[PDB]
């Protein structure tokens, strides 16, 4: 059998998709140990968002499943009398998952408080972190989409798969020859709006675009929507994410019957104050719950914000430095041969970095056996499972095959790159790979890695549904 496999890899390497590539490809039997199968196991690659798999390793290590992350409102002092306060100070560190509702549930904590006016300015404190919002390498046109969103202390979380930085733009069609209705979502009031889109007649091209032109924090509306298009919608980033969280405090407070004579700013709360008063607070699910969303769909926002918790953990210091050093420290802790590895960022978003087939696999071992090893796994992504927080990535993919809700394995795309790795659970024995594609110049060539993937869960001894 061993023979057939290897064979059988072999051939499906073979695909001219993969053609000018080189092709990183690991396989060993968690189990026996076993050397499966390997190819330019030890050649250096960009992993592109396997390089989370790094990130999630090194932050259960540091942080822990029980780990969790908070935020707070805090004043100089209580309020008193008239129910007043000066400043106020929105502090956030490092929740990835605070959500508009948890800001809601805050404004009303600080009325509940006893407060009823903000005499002072309301600041936005996210010096939990440093102020470097992108990665030294990202590229600026990837910018203005939500894998690409500045990195913040305080920042807001769209939806359930709480995308950072964000903000939802919608563009609903008017009659023909009118301005289309663009709504800017959370942005509202906070960014400023430039529509110059159309609605075109019924039957038209949709040519619309929604776009944030680098270093503004404008979004900007061109193109036309035709008359019976369905209304669109899109996710945009905005400039400072803590100027938006304060922004929507803002309104939450409003909202709480809290009035606000100051104005939203960013700033870190004085070290002068030496009992500032915490009117409210807000506590995040634990990382077990958090890692989830983010193994699942693979949020950018979400690796780099865990590296500078890390950062924040291993050295009191949320920097990309620091949480990179830790990174890399941790997994050195777990047994894991750092040698050929290149820490650049954590969501693999950068073209800075490097790792080696036979680094992952390694590392899929070792956390194999980790005592978190089972909420580690529930995160990677299914191969082929319809529901989105079980398939994440990997929904629309192996469906009907022997690798049907059997593989996991964490995904990662960007142009020239691809790669999966993961486990294979079987009878026939317990499977760790790990693919990593680079070179190719059409698209990724998932085809081949599902192949490598499906003919590996038959092997573990899984048979394709009829
Ligand atoms: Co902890
Ligand atoms: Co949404
Ligand atoms: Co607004
Ligand atoms: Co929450
Ligand atoms: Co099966």
Redesign the pocket.
């Known amino acids: 059998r061993l023979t057939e496999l290897r064979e059988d890899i072999d051939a499906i390497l073979e695909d001219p998709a993969l053609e000018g590539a080189v092709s990183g490809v690991v396989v060993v039997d968690t189990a026996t140990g076993e050397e499966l199968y390997s190819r330019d196991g030890g050649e250096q690659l960009l992993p592109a968002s396997n390089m989370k798999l790094f990130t999630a390793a090194a932050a259960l290590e540091v942080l822990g499943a029980d780990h969790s992350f908070g935020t707070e409102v805090a004043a100089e002092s209580a309020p008193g009398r008239r129910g007043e306060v000066q400043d106020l100070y929105l502090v956030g560190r490092g929740?990835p998952?605070?959500?508009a509702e948890?800001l809601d549930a805050m404004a009303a904590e600080v009325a509940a408080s006893g407060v009823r006016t903000v005499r002072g300015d309301l600041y936005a404190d996210d010096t939990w972190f440093d102020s470097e919002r992108l990665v030294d390498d990202w590229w600026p046109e990837d910018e203005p989409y939500a894998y690409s969103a500045q990195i913040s202390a305080l920042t807001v979380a769209h939806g359930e798969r709480f995308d950072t930085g964000v903000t939802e733009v919608s563009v609903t069609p008017a009659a023909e020859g009118e301005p289309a209705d663009v709504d800017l979502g959370a942005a509202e009031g906070y960014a400023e709006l430039d529509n110059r889109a159309v609605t075109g007649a019924a039957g038209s091209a949709n040519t619309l675009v929604i776009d944030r032109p680098v270093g503004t924090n404008t979004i900007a509306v061109t193109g036309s929507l035709p008359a019976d298009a369905a209304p669109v919608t899109a996710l945009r980033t905005v400039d400072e994410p803590a100027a938006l969280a304060g922004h929507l405090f803002e309104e939450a407070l409003e909202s709480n019957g809290v009035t606000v004579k100051g104005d939203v700013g960013l700033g870190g709360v004085p070290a002068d104050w030496q009992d500032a008063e915490v009117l409210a607070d807000?506590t995040?699910?634990e990382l077990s719950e958090i890692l989830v969303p983010f193994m699942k769909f693979s949020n950018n926002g979400h690796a780099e914000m865990l590296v500078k918790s890390i950062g924040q953990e291993t050295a009191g210091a949320g920097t990309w430095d620091a949480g990179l050093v830790g990174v890399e420290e941790a997994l050195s802790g777990l047994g894991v041969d750092t040698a050929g590895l290149v820490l650049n960022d954590g969501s693999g978003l950068s073209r800075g970095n490097l790792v080696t087939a036979d680094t992952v696999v390694d590392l899929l071992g070792q956390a194999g056996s980790a005592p978190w090893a089972q909420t580690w796994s529930a995160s990677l992504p299914v191969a082929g499972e319809s529901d989105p927080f079980v398939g994440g990535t990997l929904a629309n993919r192996m469906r009907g095959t022997a690798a049907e809700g059997v593989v996991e394995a964490k995904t990662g795309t960007m142009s020239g790159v691809s790669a999966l790795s993961g486990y294979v659970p079987g009878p026939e024995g317990e499977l760790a790979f790990s693919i990593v594609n680079n070179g190719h110049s059409g698209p990724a060539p998932l085809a081949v890695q599902d192949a490598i993937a499906v003919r590996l869960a038959e092997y573990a001894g899984h048979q394709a549904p009829e």
């Open positions: 929740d998952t605070l959500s948890d807000h995040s699910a």
